Amino acid sequence: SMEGILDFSNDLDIALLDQVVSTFYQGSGVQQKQAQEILTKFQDNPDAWQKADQILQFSTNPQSKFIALSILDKLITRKWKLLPNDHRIGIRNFVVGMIISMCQDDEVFKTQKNLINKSDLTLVQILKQEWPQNWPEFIPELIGSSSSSVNVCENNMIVLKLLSEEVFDFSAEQMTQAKALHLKNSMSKEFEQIFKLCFQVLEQGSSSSLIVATLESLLRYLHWIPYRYIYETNILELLSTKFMTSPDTRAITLKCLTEVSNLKIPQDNDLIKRQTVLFFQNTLQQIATSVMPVTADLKATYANANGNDQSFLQDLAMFLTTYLARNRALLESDESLRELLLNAHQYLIQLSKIEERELFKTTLDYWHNLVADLFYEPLKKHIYEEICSQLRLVIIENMVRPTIQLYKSEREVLVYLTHLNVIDTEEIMISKLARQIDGSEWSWHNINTLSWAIGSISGTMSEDTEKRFVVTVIKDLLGLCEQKRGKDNKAVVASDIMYVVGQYPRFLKAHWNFLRTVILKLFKFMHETHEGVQDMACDTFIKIVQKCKYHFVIQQPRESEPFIQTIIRDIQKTTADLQPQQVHTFYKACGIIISEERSVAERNRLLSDLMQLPNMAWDTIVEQSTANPTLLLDSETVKIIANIIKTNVAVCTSMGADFYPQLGHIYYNMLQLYRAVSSMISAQVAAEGLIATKTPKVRGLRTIKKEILKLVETYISKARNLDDVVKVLVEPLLNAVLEDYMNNVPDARDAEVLNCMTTVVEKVGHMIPQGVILILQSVFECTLDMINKDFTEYPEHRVEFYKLLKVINEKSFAAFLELPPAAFKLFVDAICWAFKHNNRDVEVNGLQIALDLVKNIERMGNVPFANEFHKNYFFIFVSETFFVLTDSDHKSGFSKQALLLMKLISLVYDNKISVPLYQEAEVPQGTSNQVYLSQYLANMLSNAFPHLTSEQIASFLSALTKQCKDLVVFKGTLRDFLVQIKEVGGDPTDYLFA
């Protein structure tokens, strides 16, 4: 029954409209749901705009008037120029003729602010179409009307505010360059009259509503107006004094002054410098006398969250940091300005204690700016010694676990502050440690934060000072753990001890007996059943090793063997209690040390001894699983194999090229294992169906294949002897994986195969051209069929597929030349298929492959394959690129679509395409490719966007082809085209902008 108003044959039953509108806004359930759908079909009716006359005049529901203003807004925005001219006067008179009335009835002027604001915006949409060419007297008549009614004078401030935003703040993407410039110039030419009305309103008071709405409009003006309007009038003193006193105007005034601190002014006028000092002195005085003194506990205020205190403290931090980053030098030399400078920073100190992550980052950025300057600029740091001293404590007490981005910022500021005063930093940290020991501030969170702070300043003190500092800290931490009761407490303190120790490798390097003691403590902690201790001991072990590895590989004075040998000997008992992933980290740590041994025979010996346990377990399994493949039907056997390979991956990760001898020990049997596993998976899918791929049994089997491919990829990516990779590794690898991939059902194909192949082609692809051909033959057509029915299925295969085609196109392009013409056509189809993905990982590769393929064809010169390529696929690539540029669903790829299009267009306007791109029947002989390209593009655009005039398409194409050697201008012309297709009657001269 609610679907009656959708019938435009009758007249609009406004009373029925206000019912369905209220059913939508105030109702619920199914009665609200379809009423919403009826309002969608009504609003989206192409003729609903002419019924907005009745709704805005007859309805009593303000939401209904709002909805119809939207219907109007779509009309003004997209079809205004198509209207009969008298309709444009009707709408324009109507809209001016309602705002006139809503401002006179004080009831509706304070009851329906949404509706008047929505009407103001509708008016601004008309001004963007008609003003000032067909409305030269808008601004003068706006000023005159303001003097009659306070309600209209305030609303005119709302109109000007929105106008400034539409023209200067939100135009770049929503209008053409030409139309934006026209509007900016028009506002600029008449701002003198706008400013006078704005200034006199602010000086003569007195309506708070009128004043605030004027200040809100001033905020927008400050984005673009010239500085003389601010510094050559008295407006700075009004903002920094009068309007800072009342809380109604306080927030907006503070935002205006923040924008003032960013104005473009001249830095050589000492008068302007004093005005910049003056408004800051006034603003800080008003804050100290009307809001809170510099000693106030801003942390407590912010946490109480009264009124708008949080937003005010946020704006104050923004104002102080913005001003001081630009102007603090104005306050640093004059002795009379020293208290102002230090009070402003003292407010920032108090602001920095607030418990508000995002606000802290804002102040932390300023502090970074300050302390970096005190570190490099002469004679500056003595001014801020007491500011800096407090900042040290604020940063130490708010240190986060090492967001990682925030920790880096805190560490950088704290390191600067330690250079500025090493002695003060040590005293603060030792004192905080004492308050941890006496228990006044003892807490798990508190001791961890301090350890992070202590660890963050590593390498900033002299080695001797560092030595006695570290010793004091470890000793006190050791005493703190000694006095604490319970495993929970003593695990936290022991972890912190390890964290700090791990953070100071310069100290560990110079004290081997201490370093040995640490490592043996870690090995002891690897038997600790308490949660997290084993993880901590492993993470500390590998961290210390990465920094002190040289001291494990050499034979230390006082001993018989490098400590690495001592670690390898006891490796079974050291790791016996660890989880497999922890054992893999341990082995990786050992691999780091071993790679430091540059005697080949000694390094290979360490490698083979480190690999003794996994090699023995490997040899037995390869024995018993070969005789005979039933043991792979054991879950326990599958885990042991996966864990053996992961160990090799871990060690290969840290050893790279050095890993080759160990790879050769297992390589040939590993690939055989890969085959055996591959058969068992295929068998299980045959016996149980596709669901077998979801079973634990098969997932454990595919894990083995995956780890094998990752091991091979890991070595080849880091190998140095490429010759051995080609002649020893690549061929057995391809025989083991290509055919097995091609001949499995889609659900049993591991996308890791494509990723492994990508690595091989990346590293040695230039050396195995028949290998690359075999890769394409085995994976191309079958993978393409998995992914060319939708954009959803097989996400990994999709990403790896185009990664693989990208590298093959880069490094062995000849493989695509050897494809049969039908297969080369699927290659082109597949590239364009990647254009249409909203997946960024597919789309960017698809566009890059296209660009790189065009370049590969260009480099071939004037030969039959390059000639046939343009005849077959040039306009396909121009058409498909244009399609994604203009469909509004691939905006993330605009830049690379533009680049590719310009390459395609420039090929023709330079005459590198030797063939004619046309059939010699459809166009006269001798016709250039440039003339045919314009004709083709004009027809394609005329059918794809029929609402455009021929003139628009021709002017657009003319500017586009002329600009195909200037990416920034070319992209500007594309953006202008993307705006004009959104509406009717776009000005074709707009394309002469550049």
Partner: peptide
């Protein structure tokens, strides 16, 4: 005080 620090750490254990 480096030799004392070494022994103090060797004595560190989690259990009472």
């Amino acid at each position: 005080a480096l030799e004392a620090l070494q022994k103090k750490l060797e004595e560190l254990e989690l259990d009472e």
